[PDB]
Ligand binder design. Structure first.
Ligand SMILES: CCCCCCCCCCCCCCCCCC(=O)OC[C@H](COP(=O)([O-])OCC(O)COP(=O)([O-])OC[C@@H](COC(=O)CCCCCCCCCCCCCCCCC)OC(=O)CCCCCCCCCCCCCCCCC)OC(=O)CCCCCCCCCCCCCCCCC
Ligand SMILES: CCCCCCCCCCCCCCCCCC(=O)OC[C@H](COP(=O)([O-])OCC(O)COP(=O)([O-])OC[C@@H](COC(=O)CCCCCCCCCCCCCCCCC)OC(=O)CCCCCCCCCCCCCCCCC)OC(=O)CCCCCCCCCCCCCCCCC
Ligand SMILES: CCCCCCCCCCCCCCCCCC(=O)OC[C@H](COP(=O)([O-])OCC(O)COP(=O)([O-])OC[C@@H](COC(=O)CCCCCCCCCCCCCCCCC)OC(=O)CCCCCCCCCCCCCCCCC)OC(=O)CCCCCCCCCCCCCCCCC
Ligand SMILES: CCCCCCCCCCCCCCCCCC(=O)OC[C@H](COP(=O)([O-])OC[C@H](O)COP(=O)([O-])OC[C@H](COC(=O)CCCCCCCCCCCCCCCCC)OC(=O)CCCCCCCCCCCCCCCCC)OC(=O)CCCCCCCCCCCCCCCCC
Ligand SMILES: CCCCCCCCCCCCCCCCCC(=O)OC[C@H](COP(=O)(O)OCCN)OC(=O)CCCCCCCCCCCCCCCCC
Ligand SMILES: CCCCCCCCCCCCCCCCCC(=O)OC[C@H](COP(=O)(O)OCCN)OC(=O)CCCCCCCCCCCCCCCCC
Ligand SMILES: CCCCCCCCCCCCCCCCCC(=O)OC[C@H](COP(=O)(O)OCCN)OC(=O)CCCCCCCCCCCCCCCCC
Ligand SMILES: CCCCCCCCCCCCCCCCCC(=O)OC[C@H](COP(=O)(O)OCCN)OC(=O)CCCCCCCCCCCCCCCCC
Lengths: 120, 140, 80, 347, 171, 105, 169, 98, 104
């Protein structure tokens, strides 16, 4: 859909116009869920090798959590960037085409006649 | 086989019965030739005569389904005088289902084919009425 | 390294000659003074017609006749 | 095989897929498919039994036929356009030939007839490569030629893929044939939404690669190739039955699991374009896939089939197999549905 | 589309150079030295107009200059030239290297009687400059009006309004 | 997945063989160099949807340069009418179309 | 008649493909593909592809069909109604195509095709002291760097692949 | 278009339908596949010489080299099949039905 | 044209000599002489495939006398030495994994 936008400057994970956007907080609940995915990956990794699930490899569980949070931060940045590009292109297309988005006259319900269907 | 469907659908319902019957018979015969071609493709018959027998049997089966479908639907549209009505294709679909039960020599297959093919022909009629798209052109 | 080189020249002289000739073929055009003249002869071979330029008024390096002094010369190719 | 030669051959497979992905010329596309096929043939013949030679021969014949039809489509493109740019095709006959060639390279129905045979004939790792990595290059070309693909053709191929991949696994007990019919049905799901929103095609491709990679890694970690050998997993490593349970309930498209995400976004982008009957038949036909998945889960995790006495010796040994990324692939294939608007990174 | 506009047969009549290719090859270097200017005006007109119908007068000047060149050869040095192009004409590939003494005779008589100097190695392959009086062609490809491009993007990139707007995901 | 690595890294891997109007060895033009240059400079940047409708004329001229279908159709019409008039005896070929006229140069 | 020489060689080309595609045996199938490669080489040579036609005779017919006949000798014993019937079916379909396009000077099998000889579509210029096709093939080294890299790597990998899969271990 | 293009396309379809209809042998299938390659070679060459597109003169050689390496790979598969089963018959390759 | 005449003349002389060699010893009507899979080598196939792949590498190498006329001589010389080097690397790998054995 938006392939003509990311074709003048290809393979940019985050362009220079992605920096005008606010980054995610470190208490972004999506990033906290990705950290929960990392902790679950650590627990499954202790389970399938028949280690103690909570105890064994606290360094390894911590690297699972850290790695998923580190990847997920940039994935959330690119998510926010692509939705901001989508809204920006939408609004510029509505602005550059007034004849295709006419101002529809809002009529109040004193004028709006609606058919009544009795429930009996 | 797109122009077969064109020369089927363009004719008004309950006006020209023999032409609609032959158009649906041609549609059914073409579909039976397709089913026969894949059946002799994936499965080798024991000779040439058995292969052309299976080909002619499936082709005449689907042609009889199409013939009795179009005939029953046009006669129902004539005796009910409701041309844009899916009950006509419901009766036509159950007639084609009883036809498939006669050809496959089994009653329960005919009853199930009555029910499911009648609902299918009703759905096709309602798609012709409200303009339902199965291969919808991309718009957004 | 010289005992192994004499060993492989005693056992397999064909392969030693092969790797020596291939080594010369790899490294020697970077050390030759005449590798430049190969390029200079190939680019100065006129396969096409020398399509002239519209004389606007200031092109002193482009000649107006073939026997004019300015322009690219091939005295180096006549002499070498 | 020599490990150095194995690494060089796997880099050649990856290089052929990358040459299809990055190149702007049709001859380099065809070169990338040739390189990919030529290097993946020894991976299929790793064990040197007659089933691998049969599978590699059938794979060679189908991919060679597809590559020749692809070069014919490229040649008719050079006829009717005088150029070689990898973009839309300038002739509907070249579009039909290239769509057939890419459908053969995917193994979509009715050209599906090599996929369960070749998948059963070769090992689980080479089957993993065949069912995940080899789907990347033809879907890249289909992503690149979508302004010229005939809609009726690609939707016929998609629904025929979904129906045949649904009815195929219902008769199967061998795990590789089940994964291959699952592949046929899921490639039908991917190409059904191609001309509507190819971002959802890439989403379905990534989620399917994660789930299939999870299932083949579980099959390699348990060394089970049949349903009945997969049944003894509860007496050997009981966490694996939980993992195959959650992954098979994911692959059926059951919420709240992330295998529901692709087909739900595909229905979400097909109803926008006023297609209601077609995603309805797709969603109803996915119940066949979910039925043979539920057959596997009944045989493996929800009940306990009888084991044998020699399992007591295997109780005394750990899994020394490199279960590479299996917890990562397990967590991504199940618990990714709250992160569903991450699909915008594929725009 | 439009009717193609061809010149008449009287616009194409010119006195031909009815000599063989070995005759043209023998005096080729003196032809390049002496008939430089109208030939280069013609080839500049030919690479700029990109139409042979726009080059007929320049081609006629080329033909007139070539005819005057061979008439100026024939009045003074006809017999060493005939001796030279016969020996060029004998060879199949028509080598210049096979006929250096007849070339020396022809070049000697030409330098002594006509003052022409045969060009050195490299000279005829020079890119020269041409003083023309015709205007520069403003659109030789007859290219019509180009389509206007799509509008570019502009403005600071504001955040997405209420996130993704994907059914219930508030971010 | 058109990972445009050739534009990200700035390498020319296969852009050179892509079109006929590219840089050729020894400056050899194709038989439809001008038509393809006109169609490319028409369709550049405007997108494929706008190029299907706004560059139809240049593309039809370029396709008819490549395949010469209208040209061969017109020559078929002229030659068939010529052979029909020889059949009817209403026409005779001129001496410049019979090989008895001592060609130009 | 002689102006239609590429068309005559192309009809011989189609007749040879109908010949070996009927598949009487891989021996005579290889012979039919050899005769077909020879006449298709003649088709290439009559447009001016002298180097590419000698690439047919030297590489295709010179190495590859030699390896096909070599393997046919070594993996098949030393040598019907269906073969001859499909042969005469293909021959009658191709001669009906010839008859249609020679009686109408126009045909449409899948696309539209002219009925005159293909001498009409040639250029009316020269290429100077070079062949355009020869210099374009010489451009494989100067302009075609990446193409040489991927082709030479695919051949190296192909040697590696055949030594792996024919080993049987 | 040109009349010879019809014949080279029809030759490709003949070797297609021969490759798409096996009789007994695998070598006949590989011969039909390389006939398909031959028709591709001829048709690409006639387009490229027809258009005087200089750079694509190296294209049919690359087609030839890649698909002849493909032919060598298929002959090696045929050799392994014939060493397993004794013949190159395609009806011996039937163990993947179960 | 002259080539086609020469090819047809060579084919005609060959066919005439074959007809003489088969039919002239059938004039002298002699006596009626009434008295009254193959083993596979992998090495034959490997020398045939090694020939085929080296012939494909030769097919890459054949435009070198035309490639030496280029203006991009550094790139041409590099890719020329690189193709001959890949042919030598194919030969070295064919050596060291016992490919050239018992038909060395
Ligand atoms: C968390 C959830 C995922 C946990 C995965 C690992 C679980 C595990 O190993 O448990 C064993 C372990 C106890 O076992 P153990 O004593 O160590 O040794 C193993 C036993 O010997 C076990 O005995 P056994 O193995 O010898 O034999 C018994 C047999 C018994 O098994 C059987 O008999 C076979 C199966 C029976 C039938 C099937 C039952 C259902 C199984 C599937 C689950 C379905 C529900 C999921 C959703 C529906 C969709 C499918 O097997 C087991 O019990 C295996 C142990 C694991 C059981 C649980 C498996 C969980 C993984 C799958 C579910 C979660 C992922 C998918 C979620 C999908 C979306 C919600 O349990 C735990 O440790 C549980 C976790 C407790 C602490 C949780 C703390 C959470 C803190 C969160 C915040 C902090 C992080 C913040 C990060 C962000 C920072 C920014
Ligand atoms: C479709 C129409 C039915 C055609 C297939 C019938 C089954 C196959 C067959 O012929 O087997 C005989 C034959 C051998 O079978 P068999 O030996 O009899 O095996 C059966 C057992 O012996 C068992 O003995 P049996 O023969 O007595 O029992 C069979 C039983 C007969 O049942 C009975 O005798 C008792 C039940 C009465 C009939 C069923 C009533 C159900 C009513 C509809 C459901 C409830 C609606 C409620 C509506 C409420 C408001 C009004 O019939 C069935 O089970 C067939 C069910 C319908 C099949 C299609 C289902 C599509 C579902 C799609 C998703 C939903 O099969 C073959 O030789 C294979 C090929 C047959 C020829 C082709 C079939 C015609 C295809 C026409 C095109 C249809 C396109 C798709 C349209 C619909 C989907 C969009
Ligand atoms: C970016 C995309 C990244 C994609 C995955 C890349 C790695 C996997 C592929 C290659 C592989 O298998 O490598 C081994 C792989 C471990 O996989 P495994 O063998 O299946 O795990 C079993 C045990 O964990 C093995 O335990 P161990 O006893 O052998 O040693 C413990 C090991 C010790 O670690 C080390 O020794 C590493 C130190 C050297 C680092 C490199 C120096 C140069 O630590 C770990 O393995 C902890 C788990 C590491 C994270 C695994 C997951 C990676 C990310 C997957 C994608 C996540 C996407 C989430 C998106 C969510 C929303 C959509 O990775 C490492 O050992 C290094 C992890 C580096 C993480 C970097 C994260 C940021 C990247 C930007
Ligand atoms: C100055 C610097 C420092 C500042 C500090 C500030 C923070 C201080 C607190 C520090 C901790 C922060 C934690 C995150 C923030 C709160 C997030 C939150 O509650 O969102 C409400 C969120 C939406 O409700 P709301 O009232 O509209 O928003 C209130 C706020 O405005 C919510 O804010 P919002 O509007 O911005 O939220 C954005 C959006 C709001 O949400 C939406 O727009 C709706 C869509 C959400 C996803 C729905 C997916 C449905 C299909 C899949 C279902 C999967 C199975 C469900 C769970 C199965 C069991 C695991 O969030 C998402 O879409 C994210 C995806 C869901 C993850 C939520 C965060 C989890 C963090 C902890 C992970 C631990 C495991 C939890 C269980 C895993 C599943 C969640 O609620 C849900 O979606 C319900 C699901 C449960 C949410 C998790 C609750 C977090 C705390 C869990 C502690 C207990 C863990 C027990 C052990 C592990 C499980 C066994
Ligand atoms: C109506 C006429 C249909 C005629 C074509 C189908 C005939 C057929 O099924 O032939 C069987 C044949 C298998 O060969 P078979 O005869 O079993 O072998 C004995 C050895 N002589 O099967 C084949 O040869 C398979 C291909 C036959 C043609 C299938 C497509 C055309 C027919 C269906 C559409 C019309
Ligand atoms: C009606 C009828 O006669 O059905 C009989 C038929 C089996 O025919 P048979 O008697 O075997 O000869 O039986 C069949 O074909 C199967 C059933 C026919 C349709 C029955 C419809 C009503 C079923 C009960 C619906 C309850 C709700
Ligand atoms: C369970 C399965 C339910 C299937 C429901 C299908 C509903 C019908 C959808 C297709 C249809 O019939 O559309 C109506 C249309 C005729 O109306 P209209 O759109 O005006 O046609 C001009 C087209 N350019 O007609 C068409 O577009 C073509 C006719 C299509 C007929 C489909 C069924 C044919 C027989 C089975 C295959
Ligand atoms: C870098 C330069 C370019 C290199 C690439 C181009 C090479 C061009 C020639 C093509 C050669 C292709 C085949 C090469 C195969 C090498 C491996 C080999 O043959 O090893 C086996 C051999 C011993 O032979 P054996 O196994 O006993 O066989 C029975 C025969 N009597 O083992 C040996 O005999 C040892 C062979 C290696 C030692 C040869 C050393 C020659 C040194 C000459 C001087 C330096 C040359 C400059 C280059 C540096 C070389 C290190």
């Amino acid at each position: 859909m938006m392939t003509g936008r990311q074709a003048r400057a290809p393979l940019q994970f985050l362009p220079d116009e992605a920096r005008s956007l606010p980054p995610p907080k470190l208490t972004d609940p999506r990033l906290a869920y990705i950290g929960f995915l990392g902790y679950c990956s650590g627990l499954i990794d202790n389970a399938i090798r028949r280690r103690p699930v909570l105890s064994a490899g606290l360094h390894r569980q911590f690297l699972y959590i850290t790695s998923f949070v580190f990847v997920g931060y940039y994935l959330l940045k690119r998510q926010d960037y692509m939705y901001a590009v989508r809204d920006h292109d939408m609004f510029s297309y509505i602005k550059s085409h007034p004849e295709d988005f006419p101002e529809k006259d809002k009529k109040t319900y004193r004028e709006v006649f609606e058919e009544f269907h009795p429930v009996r | 086989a797109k122009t077969l469907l064109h020369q089927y659908w363009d004719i008004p319902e309950g006006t020209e019965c023999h032409r609609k019957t032959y158009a649906a018979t041609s549609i059914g015969g073409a579909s039976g030739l397709v089913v026969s071609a894949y059946s002799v493709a994936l499965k080798t018959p024991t000779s040439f005569l058995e292969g052309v027998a299976r080909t002619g049997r499936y082709t005449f089966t689907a042609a009889a389904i199409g013939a009795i479908f179009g005939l029953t639907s046009c006669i129902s549209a004539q005796v009910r005088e409701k041309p844009d009505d899916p009950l006509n294709y419901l009766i036509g679909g159950c007639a084609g289902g009883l036809t498939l039960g006669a050809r496959t020599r089994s009653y329960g297959i005919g009853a199930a084919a009555c029910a499911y093919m009648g609902l299918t022909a009703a759905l096709v009629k309602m798609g012709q009425l409200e303009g339902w798209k199965v291969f919808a052109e991309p718009k957004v | 390294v010289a005992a192994f080189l004499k060993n492989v020249w005693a056992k397999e002289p064909v392969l030693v000659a092969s790797f020596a000739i291939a080594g010369l073929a790899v490294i020697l055009p970077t050390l030759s003074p005449y590798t430049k003249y190969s390029l200079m002869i190939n680019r100065a071979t006129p396969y096409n017609y020398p399509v002239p330029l519209r004389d606007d008024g200031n092109m002193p390096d482009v000649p107006s006749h073939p026997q004019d002094p300015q322009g690219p010369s091939l005295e180096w190719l006549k002499r070498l | 095989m020599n490990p150095i030669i194995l690494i060089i051959i796997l880099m050649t497979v990856m290089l052929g897929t990358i040459i299809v992905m990055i190149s702007t010329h049709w001859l380099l596309i065809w070169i990338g498919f040739e390189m990919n096929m030529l290097a993946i043939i020894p991976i299929m013949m790793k064990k040197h039994n007659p089933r691998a030679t049969e599978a590699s021969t059938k794979y060679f014949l189908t991919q060679s036929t597809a590559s020749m039809l692809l070069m014919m489509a490229i040649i008719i493109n050079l006829m009717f356009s005088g150029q070689w740019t990898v973009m839309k095709l300038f002739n509907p006959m070249a579009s039909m030939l290239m769509t057939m060639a890419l459908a053969m390279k995917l193994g979509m129905a009715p050209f599906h007839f090599w996929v369960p045979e070749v998948t059963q004939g070769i090992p689980l790792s080479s089957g993993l490569i065949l069912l995940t990595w080899q789907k990347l290059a033809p879907m890249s070309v289909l992503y690149q030629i979508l302004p010229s693909i005939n809609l009726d053709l690609i939707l016929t191929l998609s629904i025929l893929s979904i129906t045949i991949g649904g009815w195929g696994g219902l008769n199967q007990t061998q795990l590789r044939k089940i994964m291959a019919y699952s592949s046929i049905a899921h490639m039908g799901w991917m190409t059904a939404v191609l001309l509507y929103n190819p971002t959802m095609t890439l989403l379905n491709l990534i989620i399917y690669i994660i789930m299939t990679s999870t299932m083949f890694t579980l099959f390699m970690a348990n060394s089970t190739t049949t349903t009945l050998s997969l049944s003894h997993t509860w007496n050997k490593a009981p966490i694996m039955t939980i993992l195959v349970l959650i992954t098979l309930l994911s692959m059926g498209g059951l919420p709240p699991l992330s295998g529901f995400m692709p087909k739900w976004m595909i229905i979400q982008e097909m109803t926008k374009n006023d297609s209601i009957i077609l995603p309805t038949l797709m969603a109803i036909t996915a119940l066949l896939n979910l039925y043979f998945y539920m057959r596997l889960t009944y045989s493996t995790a929800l009940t306990m089939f009888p084991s044998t006495n020699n399992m007591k010796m295997k109780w005394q040994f750990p899994t020394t197999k490199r279960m590479t990324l299996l917890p990562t692939m397990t967590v991504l294939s199940t618990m990714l549905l709250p992160l569903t608007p991450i699909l915008s990174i594929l725009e | 589309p439009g009717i193609v506009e061809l010149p008449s047969l009287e616009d194409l009549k010119v006195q031909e150079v009815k000599v063989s290719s070995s005759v043209l090859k023998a005096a080729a270097h003196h032809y390049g030295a002496q008939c430089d200017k109208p030939n280069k005006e013609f080839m500049l007109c030919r690479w700029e107009e990109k139409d042979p119908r726009r080059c007929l007068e320049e081609g006629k000047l080329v033909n007139q200059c070539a005819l005057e060149f061979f008439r100026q050869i024939k009045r003074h040095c006809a017999e060493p030239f005939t001796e030279y192009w016969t020996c060029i004409d004998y060879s199949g590939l028509q080598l210049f290297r096979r006929c250096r003494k007849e070339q020396a005779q022809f070049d000697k008589c030409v330098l002594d009687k006509l003052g022409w100097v045969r060009p050195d190695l490299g000279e005829l392959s020079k890119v020269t400059k041409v003083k023309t009086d015709r205007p520069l062609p403003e659109n030789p490809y007859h290219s019509r009006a180009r389509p206007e491009p799509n509008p570019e993007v502009e403005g600071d990139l504001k955040p997405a309004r209420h996130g993704s707007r994907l059914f219930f995901w508030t971010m | 997945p058109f990972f445009d690595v050739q534009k990200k890294l700035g390498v020319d891997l296969d852009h050179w063989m892509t079109i006929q109007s590219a840089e050729q060895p020894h400056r050899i033009p194709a038989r439809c160099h001008a038509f393809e240059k006109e169609w490319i400079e028409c369709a550049h940047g405007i997108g494929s949807i706008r190029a299907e409708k706004e560059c139809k004329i240049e593309f039809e001229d370029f396709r008819e340069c490549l395949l010469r279908q209208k040209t061969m159709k017109r020559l078929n019409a002229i030659k068939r009418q010529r052979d029909k008039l020889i059949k009817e005896g209403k026409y005779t070929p001129p001496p410049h179309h019979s090989g008895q006229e001592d060609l130009r140069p | 008649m002689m102006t239609y020489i590429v068309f005559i060689l192309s009809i011989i080309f189609v007749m040879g493909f109908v010949g070996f595609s009927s598949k009487p045996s891989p021996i005579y199938g290889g012979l039919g593909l050899i005769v077909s490669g020879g006449v298709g080489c003649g088709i290439v040579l009559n447009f001016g592809g002298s180097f590419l036609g000698l690439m047919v005779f030297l590489i295709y017919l010179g190495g590859m069909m030699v390896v096909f006949g070599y393997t046919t000798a070594m993996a098949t014993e030393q040598y019907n109604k269906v073969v001859l019937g499909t042969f005469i079916t293909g021959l009658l379909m191709e001669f009906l195509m010839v008859y249609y396009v020679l009686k109408d000077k126009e045909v449409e099998i899948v696309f539209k095709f002219n009925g005159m000889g293909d001498w009409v579509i040639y250029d009316t210029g020269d290429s100077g002291f070079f062949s355009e096709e020869a210099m374009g093939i010489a451009a494989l080294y100067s302009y075609g760097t990446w193409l040489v890299i991927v082709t030479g790597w695919s051949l190296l990998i192909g040697v590696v692949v055949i030594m792996e899969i024919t080993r049987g271990n | 278009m040109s009349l010879v293009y019809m014949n080279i396309m029809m030759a490709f379809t003949v070797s297609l339908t021969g490759l798409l209809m096996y009789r007994s042998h695998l070598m006949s299938s590989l011969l039909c596949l390389e006939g398909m390659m031959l028709s591709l070679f001829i048709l690409a060459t006639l387009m490229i010489l027809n258009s005087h597109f200089t750079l694509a003169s190296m294209m049919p050689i690359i087609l030839l080299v890649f698909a002849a390496c493909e032919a060598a790979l298929g002959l090696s598969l045929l050799v392994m099949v014939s060493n397993t089963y004794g013949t190159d018959y395609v009806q011996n390759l039937n163990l993947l039905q179960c | 044209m002259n080539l086609m005449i020469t090819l047809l003349t060579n084919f005609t002389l060959a066919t005439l000599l074959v007809t003489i060699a088969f039919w002239l010893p059938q004039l002298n009507v002699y006596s009626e002489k009434t008295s009254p899979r193959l083993p596979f080598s992998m090495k034959f196939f490997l020398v045939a495939i090694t020939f085929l792949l080296f012939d494909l590498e030769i097919a890459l190498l054949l435009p070198l006398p035309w490639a030496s006329q280029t203006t991009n001589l550094n790139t041409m010389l590099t890719m020329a030495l690189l193709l001959i080097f890949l042919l030598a690397v194919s030969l070295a790998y064919e050596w060291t994994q016992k490919g050239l054995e018992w038909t060395e």
